[PDB]
Scaffold this active site. Structure first.
Site, PDB file in Angstrom:
ATOM      1  N   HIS A   1      45.991  40.668  40.281  1.00 62.50           N
ATOM      2  CA  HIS A   1      46.102  40.716  41.730  1.00 62.50           C
ATOM      3  C   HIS A   1      44.740  40.988  42.357  1.00 62.50           C
ATOM      4  O   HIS A   1      43.768  41.327  41.678  1.00 62.50           O
ATOM      5  CB  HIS A   1      47.119  41.782  42.152  1.00 62.50           C
ATOM      6  CG  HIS A   1      48.497  41.542  41.617  1.00 62.50           C
ATOM      7  ND1 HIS A   1      49.434  42.545  41.491  1.00 62.50           N
ATOM      8  CD2 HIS A   1      49.095  40.411  41.175  1.00 62.50           C
ATOM      9  CE1 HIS A   1      50.550  42.042  40.994  1.00 62.50           C
ATOM     10  NE2 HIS A   1      50.371  40.749  40.794  1.00 62.50           N
TER      11      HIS A   1
ATOM     12  N   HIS B   1      45.410  44.047  35.993  1.00 63.92           N
ATOM     13  CA  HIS B   1      46.103  43.327  37.049  1.00 63.92           C
ATOM     14  C   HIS B   1      45.610  41.889  37.093  1.00 63.92           C
ATOM     15  O   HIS B   1      44.496  41.578  36.667  1.00 63.92           O
ATOM     16  CB  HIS B   1      45.869  43.968  38.424  1.00 63.92           C
ATOM     17  CG  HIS B   1      47.011  44.793  38.927  1.00 63.92           C
ATOM     18  ND1 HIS B   1      46.847  45.778  39.876  1.00 63.92           N
ATOM     19  CD2 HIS B   1      48.332  44.768  38.635  1.00 63.92           C
ATOM     20  CE1 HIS B   1      48.016  46.334  40.139  1.00 63.92           C
ATOM     21  NE2 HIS B   1      48.934  45.739  39.399  1.00 63.92           N
TER      22      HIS B   1
ATOM     23  N   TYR C   1      30.990  29.422  44.212  1.00 58.58           N
ATOM     24  CA  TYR C   1      29.573  29.095  44.328  1.00 58.58           C
ATOM     25  C   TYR C   1      29.045  28.346  43.111  1.00 58.58           C
ATOM     26  O   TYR C   1      28.070  27.595  43.228  1.00 58.58           O
ATOM     27  CB  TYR C   1      28.756  30.367  44.563  1.00 58.58           C
ATOM     28  CG  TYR C   1      29.003  31.015  45.910  1.00 58.58           C
ATOM     29  CD1 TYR C   1      29.767  30.377  46.880  1.00 58.58           C
ATOM     30  CD2 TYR C   1      28.466  32.258  46.216  1.00 58.58           C
ATOM     31  CE1 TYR C   1      29.994  30.961  48.112  1.00 58.58           C
ATOM     32  CE2 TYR C   1      28.688  32.849  47.447  1.00 58.58           C
ATOM     33  CZ  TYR C   1      29.453  32.196  48.390  1.00 58.58           C
ATOM     34  OH  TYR C   1      29.677  32.780  49.616  1.00 58.58           O
TER      35      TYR C   1
ATOM     36  N   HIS D   1      45.254  56.095  43.200  1.00 62.18           N
ATOM     37  CA  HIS D   1      45.874  54.857  43.676  1.00 62.18           C
ATOM     38  C   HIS D   1      46.908  55.138  44.767  1.00 62.18           C
ATOM     39  O   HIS D   1      48.030  54.628  44.742  1.00 62.18           O
ATOM     40  CB  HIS D   1      46.496  54.089  42.505  1.00 62.18           C
ATOM     41  CG  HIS D   1      46.622  52.616  42.736  1.00 62.18           C
ATOM     42  ND1 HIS D   1      47.823  51.947  42.637  1.00 62.18           N
ATOM     43  CD2 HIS D   1      45.696  51.679  43.047  1.00 62.18           C
ATOM     44  CE1 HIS D   1      47.631  50.663  42.881  1.00 62.18           C
ATOM     45  NE2 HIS D   1      46.348  50.474  43.131  1.00 62.18           N
TER      46      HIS D   1
ATOM     47  N   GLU E   1      34.492  37.455  40.425  1.00 58.56           N
ATOM     48  CA  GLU E   1      33.624  36.335  40.774  1.00 58.56           C
ATOM     49  C   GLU E   1      32.232  36.813  41.165  1.00 58.56           C
ATOM     50  O   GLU E   1      31.238  36.140  40.869  1.00 58.56           O
ATOM     51  CB  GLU E   1      34.250  35.520  41.907  1.00 58.56           C
ATOM     52  CG  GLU E   1      33.426  34.320  42.344  1.00 58.56           C
ATOM     53  CD  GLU E   1      34.107  33.509  43.427  1.00 58.56           C
ATOM     54  OE1 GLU E   1      35.204  33.910  43.871  1.00 58.56           O
ATOM     55  OE2 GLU E   1      33.547  32.469  43.833  1.00 58.56           O
TER      56      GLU E   1
ATOM     57  N   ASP F   1      43.366  43.272  44.342  1.00 57.17           N
ATOM     58  CA  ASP F   1      42.688  44.564  44.360  1.00 57.17           C
ATOM     59  C   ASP F   1      42.103  44.962  43.010  1.00 57.17           C
ATOM     60  O   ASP F   1      41.443  46.005  42.937  1.00 57.17           O
ATOM     61  CB  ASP F   1      43.645  45.652  44.853  1.00 57.17           C
ATOM     62  CG  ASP F   1      44.952  45.669  44.091  1.00 57.17           C
ATOM     63  OD1 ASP F   1      45.433  44.581  43.708  1.00 57.17           O
ATOM     64  OD2 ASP F   1      45.502  46.769  43.877  1.00 57.17           O
ATOM     65  N   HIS F   2      42.317  44.179  41.949  1.00 58.24           N
ATOM     66  CA  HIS F   2      41.723  44.467  40.650  1.00 58.24           C
ATOM     67  C   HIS F   2      40.904  43.324  40.067  1.00 58.24           C
ATOM     68  O   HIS F   2      40.186  43.551  39.086  1.00 58.24           O
ATOM     69  CB  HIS F   2      42.802  44.852  39.626  1.00 58.24           C
ATOM     70  CG  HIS F   2      43.420  46.196  39.861  1.00 58.24           C
ATOM     71  ND1 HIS F   2      44.193  46.833  38.914  1.00 58.24           N
ATOM     72  CD2 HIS F   2      43.384  47.022  40.933  1.00 58.24           C
ATOM     73  CE1 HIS F   2      44.603  47.995  39.390  1.00 58.24           C
ATOM     74  NE2 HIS F   2      44.127  48.133  40.614  1.00 58.24           N
TER      75      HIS F   2
END
Ligand SMILES: [Zn+2]
Ligand SMILES: [Zn+2]
Ligand SMILES: [Zn+2]
Ligand SMILES: [Zn+2]
Lengths: 238, 238
Positions: free
Chosen positions: A62, A60, A108, A219, A70, A64-65
């Site tokens: 998006h 993904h 960061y 899911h 990061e 949620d994946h």
């Protein structure tokens, strides 16, 4: 070769984490499929230190994946002395991952590209069929382009360990043309017809064939209080 | 006029949610400051139904403060019959919120702009000082541009209920020129010097003046096992 479902809920679930798979192969390679915002916490709940992660697979672009990517680059570059690990990303989702979904740079450790935090393994894809890409001596990956939302590319992954097809991970809407030529199958499941997910009733509409022993659901929505197919239990190994 | 800290942890915390404030004013107006990926779950944990939300204030264009906005528009447009509510956004963070941070469109309700899911209240800002913007009969908001990361605009908010300054919410690095002209002050706190957050030692470096009774700390790391300043306790009212 065993799998551990870190999270099992959908994007808006509150009882389960983001649907992510923790695959450990026969050669000691630990692979994580998708890393959302709550996946690093799901790893901290499952008592698996993040220092053991060898590669991350992305299906993904998006939240949620890719939400926790990061944080992974944060942990590796700062605490782990910049241990650049594998970020298995399909080719079409590379430029869309860094420039767009990650704001062209992390917060960061501001500006640099994606090659500074991970060893980008551009996997091969196309739209008319599956695609194979070798990784190590016995780590193969088959990528199938799934339809999720319009004008955006999602992918399903199959895993072959030293030759044998181990598990088919869908990460997708109800696709009529399936391949389950695989030992096990984990499929996205929804509780409401329509939208951009495969619903449970659509799975039962394609079920009288006794292949239900292989199918596993994942899911899904948060209201879970629940035919031969067994749901993926969060925190259950293999 | 009382405040409830929904979440208190930083972006990478696992024990506490995303730092968000739940303010309920004297006229029954319920305001939420920032809505990250784990904030809707923090609302579900605090046993406050989302149908009571009247407005949402945004001080970030980053994941930990805008992650749950797509879920809020999901709940309002689908379950609540499209109840368009207040999305208090500063003027400079409007075009950067929809086109960039939300991928120019939501996933489950694909293309439409931000005015279709919320009543965008463009708040007034500038860079040399504070800025006042009235909302209702007794709901005023003072916005102070804080420095977080380079080449990106963050903001601190102050709340005035029927005239009186109630609380100063910083949502920021260690800013030398503060105003604490406010009854209460909630300030971002960090456990390590440097980075893009105000650290605890920097707060103690500016502390011999007995204004410590007013200061409250928030938005901190996960290792929390812990001078007159009291930390914001998650799940504590007023
Ligand atoms: Zn998914
Ligand atoms: Zn998806
Ligand atoms: Zn914050
Ligand atoms: Zn911030």
């Amino acid at each position: 070769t065993q799998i551990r479902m870190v999270g099992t809920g959908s994007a808006f679930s509150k009882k389960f984490y983001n649907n992510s798979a923790l695959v450990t192969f026969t050669n000691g390679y630990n692979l994580l499929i998708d890393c959302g915002h709550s996946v690093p916490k799901g790893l901290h709940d499952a008592d698996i230190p993040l220092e053991s992660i060898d590669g991350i697979l992305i299906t993904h672009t998006h939240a949620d994946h890719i939400g926790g990517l990061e944080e992974v680059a944060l942990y590796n570059k700062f605490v782990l002395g910049g241990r650049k690990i594998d970020l298995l990303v399909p080719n079409t989702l590379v430029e869309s991952l860094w420039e767009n979904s990650l704001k062209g740079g992390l917060r960061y450790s501001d500006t640099l590209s994606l090659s500074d935090y991970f060893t980008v393994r551009s996997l091969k894809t196309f739209t008319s069929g599956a695609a194979r890409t070798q990784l190590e001596e016995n780590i193969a990956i088959k990528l199938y382009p799934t339809f999720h939302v319009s004008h955006m590319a999602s992918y399903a992954v199959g895993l072959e360990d030293r030759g044998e097809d181990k598990v088919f991970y869908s990460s997708t809407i109800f696709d009529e043309y399936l391949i389950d030529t695989y030992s096990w199958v984990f499929h996205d499941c929804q509780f409401f017809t329509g939208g951009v997910h495969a619903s449970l009733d659509e799975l039962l509409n394609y079920i009288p064939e006794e292949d239900q022993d292989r199918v596993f659901l994942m899911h899904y929505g948060d209201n879970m209080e629940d035919g031969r197919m067994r749901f993926a239990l969060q925190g259950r190994t293999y």
